[PDB]
Amino acid sequence: VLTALELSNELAKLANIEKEFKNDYRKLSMQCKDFVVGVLDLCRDSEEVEAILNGDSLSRVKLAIKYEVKKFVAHPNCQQQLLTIWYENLSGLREQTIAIKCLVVLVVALGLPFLAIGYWIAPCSRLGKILRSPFMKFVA
Amino acid sequence: TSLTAEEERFLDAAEYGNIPVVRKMLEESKTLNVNCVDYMGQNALQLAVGNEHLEVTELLLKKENLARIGDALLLAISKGYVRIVEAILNHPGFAASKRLTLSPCEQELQDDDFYAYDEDGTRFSPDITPIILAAHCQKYEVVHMLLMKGARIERPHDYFCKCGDCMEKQRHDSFSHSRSRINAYKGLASPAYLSLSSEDP
Numbered sequence A: 001v002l003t004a005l006e007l008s009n010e011l012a013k014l015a016n017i018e019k020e021f022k023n024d025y026r027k028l029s030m031q032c033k034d035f036v037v038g039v040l041d042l043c044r045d046s047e048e049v050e051a052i053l054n055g056d057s058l059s060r061v062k063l064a065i066k067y068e069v070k071k072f073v074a075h076p077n078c079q080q081q082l083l084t085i086w087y088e089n090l091s092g093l094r095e096q097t098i099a100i101k102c103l104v105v106l107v108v109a110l111g112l113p114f115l116a117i118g119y120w121i122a123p124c125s126r127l128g129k130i131l132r133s134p135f136m137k138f139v140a
Numbered sequence B: 001t002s003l004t005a006e007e008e009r010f011l012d013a014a015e016y017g018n019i020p021v022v023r024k025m026l027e028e029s030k031t032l033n034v035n036c037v038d039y040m041g042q043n044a045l046q047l048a049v050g051n052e053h054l055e056v057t058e059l060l061l062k063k064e065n066l067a068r069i070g071d072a073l074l075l076a077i078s079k080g081y082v083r084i085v086e087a088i089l090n091h092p093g094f095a096a097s098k099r100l101t102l103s104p105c106e107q108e109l110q111d112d113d114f115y116a117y118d119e120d121g122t123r124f125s126p127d128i129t130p131i132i133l134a135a136h137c138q139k140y141e142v143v144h145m146l147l148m149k150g151a152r153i154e155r156p157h158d159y160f161c162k163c164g165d166c167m168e169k170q171r172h173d174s175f176s177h178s179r180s181r182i183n184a185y186k187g188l189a190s191p192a193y194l195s196l197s198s199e200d201p
């Protein structure tokens, strides 16, 4: 999968450089992207999904984002992992509606200085884990 | 490989449908174990199932000690081998056990290689029952036969269910849980299972 991703990068770069056989190189890059997506598709367990998403830190997801492999990153097998990591240490908020999320944003906005002041004890506090989540960073 | 001459002759005769050769092999032969499998090959019964041979499969089913029956049942269900499915379901293993109704993942301690594929995994997902696979392939005859034996697609719980079983599955390997739910719904939403499942479909 890493070989296919680097080959997709190389084929896209050569498509840009050549400008004569750009269609052929773009088709080859699409073939590499399709192979990567097909390899990701056959996952049936979280362990296999993690193994494809990073080798022996979403290394492969980051490397595919760098190479504009849209279908590998937008695949549900990767979105299920990205959502679990995104809603880390707060899982009940994922199923809430958009209105509840906006209410959470407003609550954070009203009490942002208070939680910032309390962040000193946050590493030893239970709420520090929530405030350090990848979602509460975006809301903050 | 580690295979010998006699068992290789058995395997090729079964794969190519040499009924008299197989019959001679299984009569008065101490060697040539019935469930001998290559390192990266299929069982003899799996080979007989893959290429339609009712007589060879039934003659293999004569032997009491023989594994990979569930995998061959799944393989036959994946195709139109209705007669082979009927022959396999006639084995006493399915009749006197909960293997048919329950999924391979949670049927038992899975000590035996009943649903096992070549080396480690399974031909399909571990949470796909034979009836779910039959619904997936929309095999009306196979679905009807499996339903007549008491095997039905158990309805998955609500997405927000908090029971011990659902929480245990969600705690570890949640992607497999979601995929199993999707597979169960795909089996339920199949026209074959919808039409042959219950009254007023």
Ligand SMILES: [Zn+2]
Pocket (backbone or CB within 6 Å): B157, B158, B161, B162, B163, B164, B165, B166, B167
């Ligand atoms: Zn439940």
